[PDB]
Every structure is written in C-alpha cells, then in structure tokens.
C-alpha cells in the first residue's frame, strides 16, 4: 500500500544493490513470507511448488535465461519484465518483497547442489532438495517481519 514502511531502503535491499547478495536466503521468517508472496504472485503459472504449470519449472537446474541463476538476474527479470521477451511479468512486489520471494524460490529448488549458483559455499552445505509437506515453523523470527503477525 504505502504508509510508513520500508520496501526499497531495508538493510537487505541495500546489501543486495551493493553486492548482489541476498541476505534472506535460508532465513526462516523471510521464507515464510516468500512462500505466501510466491503463492499469490507466481504459483498461478509456475505451480504451487514452482514445478511448472503454464510457466516453466523454476525448481530445477535448467534455465532458459541463465541470468536467472543469480538473484540479481531473477530480480531484473521481474522488475524489468514489463512487456518484454522473458514472460508476462509485471513489477508488483516491492524490492524487499521480491528478495523474500526469490529466497523462497531458491528454497523450492530440487536439483543438483552444485548447480545452485545462488548459494555460497556454506549455504550449499545446508542445501537439501525441497520436499512437499515441509512446514516452516510458524513462530520463526528473523530479518523479516511476519506478513500476518
């Protein structure tokens, strides 16, 4: 909406614009939000688990546009999708919400650990193919304020 919030000046967005790093990767509070944001903005075409439906599966190691293997690339795709050639994507999420959504898409990954270029050395160590039924603890607290609270 608007009012008094953040969106484009949060520490995560600042860090992202400085190094391309997504501080929300593996942050449970951000993942909980991202799961919800992904649901209403992307799942309708990419599937509930990003397995693919009308749009391609975003949970595997094949990418039509490899730039999407980095969070900056994925971000640019949606924010600059405005009638282009990489899909029917419109900038509807704030920059901060986008990072949370991207963090969730990465969490939905089910492919080879070595192809997860969006994860650093440590995060790759903690990577595990997403399995349906998983439940992010609802009392999880982190860098992201719960969308419901």
Q: Which residues are annotated as a binding site?
A: 42, 45-46
List phi, psi (to 5°) of 44.
-55, -25
Q: What is the DSSP string of 87-121?
A: -S----S-HHHHHHHHHHHHHT--S-GGG-TTS-H
46 DSSP 8-state letter: H
Q: How far apart are CA 113 and CA 117, in angstroms?
A: 9
Can residue 89 be called a binding residue for ligand HEM (CB under 6 A)?
A: yes
Part of the chain binding ligand HEM (CB under 6 A), chosen from 17-25, 83-91, 108-116, 139-147: 83-91
Q: Which of 8, 9, 40, 62 binds Ca ion (CB under 5 A)?
A: 62
Can residue 68 be called a binding residue for ligand HEM (CB under 6 A)?
A: yes
Q: Which is nearer to ligand HEM, 32 or 89 (CB)?
A: 89
Can residue 64 be called a binding residue for ligand HEM (CB under 6 A)?
A: yes
């Amino acid at each position: 909406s608007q009012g008094k919030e953040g969106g484009r000046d949060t520490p995560a967005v600042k860090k992202f614009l400085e190094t391309g790093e997504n501080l929300y990767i593996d942050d449970k509070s951000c993942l909980r939000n991202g799961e919800s944001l992904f649901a209403t903005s992307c799942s309708g075409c990419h599937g509930h688990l990003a397995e693919g439906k009308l749009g391609p599966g975003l949970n595997d190691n094949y990418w039509t546009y490899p730039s999407n293997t980095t969070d900056v690339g994925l971000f640019a795709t949606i924010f600059g999708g405005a009638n282009g050639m990489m899909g029917p994507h419109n900038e509807n999420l704030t920059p901060d919400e986008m990072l949370q959504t991207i963090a969730w898409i990465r969490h939905l990954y089910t492919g080879p650990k070595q192809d997860a270029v969006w994860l650093n050395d440590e995060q790759k160590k903690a990577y595990t193919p997403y399995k349906q039924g998983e439940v992010i603890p609802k009392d999880a607290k982190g860098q992201c304020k719960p969308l419901d609270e």
